[PDB]
């Protein structure tokens, strides 16, 4: 496959896109599925 292109962010313009995927997945819902988040994530901790 490969690894990334590996730039540096001391001259920062680019950042990870998979966090883009996840955050746009969850960061538009209110505290109910956030309760889902709390419940099933502190399932383990």
């Amino acid at each position: 496959e490969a690894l990334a292109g590996a730039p540096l962010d001391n001259a920062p313009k680019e950042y990870p896109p998979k966090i883009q995927q996840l955050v746009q997945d969850i960061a538009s819902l209110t505290l109910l599925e956030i309760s889902d988040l709390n419940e099933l994530l502190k399932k383990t901790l």
Binding site: A6, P7, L8, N10, A11
Partner: protein
């Protein structure tokens, strides 16, 4: 790097090597640092320090020295080989 050891690097005050790790023109300044930071040339005087500036997006390798007469010889080796800048630095230190 035996000739620089036989030259007596002692009149210099500060040398430093600014370069980037990932670019396709940085091996020459890296071997310059490898010739300059050896034990003999760094042991011919202890009153000087050699710095190795590492940056990612600088995008141009540069070498600059300043020596006892207050002058400043700066050579941006990106299209210079190691031995050319070594004999330049050698003759330029032996003149002053």
């Amino acid at each position: 790097a035996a000739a620089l050891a036989r030259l007596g690097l002692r009149p210099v005050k500060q040398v430093r090597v600014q370069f980037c790790p990932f670019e396709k023109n940085v091996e020459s300044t890296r071997t310059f640092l490898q010739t300059v930071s050896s034990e003999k040339v760094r042991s011919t005087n202890l009153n000087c320090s050699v710095i190795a500036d590492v940056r990612h997006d600088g995008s141009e390798p540069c070498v600059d020295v300043l020596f006892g007469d207050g002058h400043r010889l700066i050579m941006r080796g990106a299209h210079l080989t190691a031995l050319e800048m070594l004999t330049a630095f050698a003759s330029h230190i032996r003149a002053r």
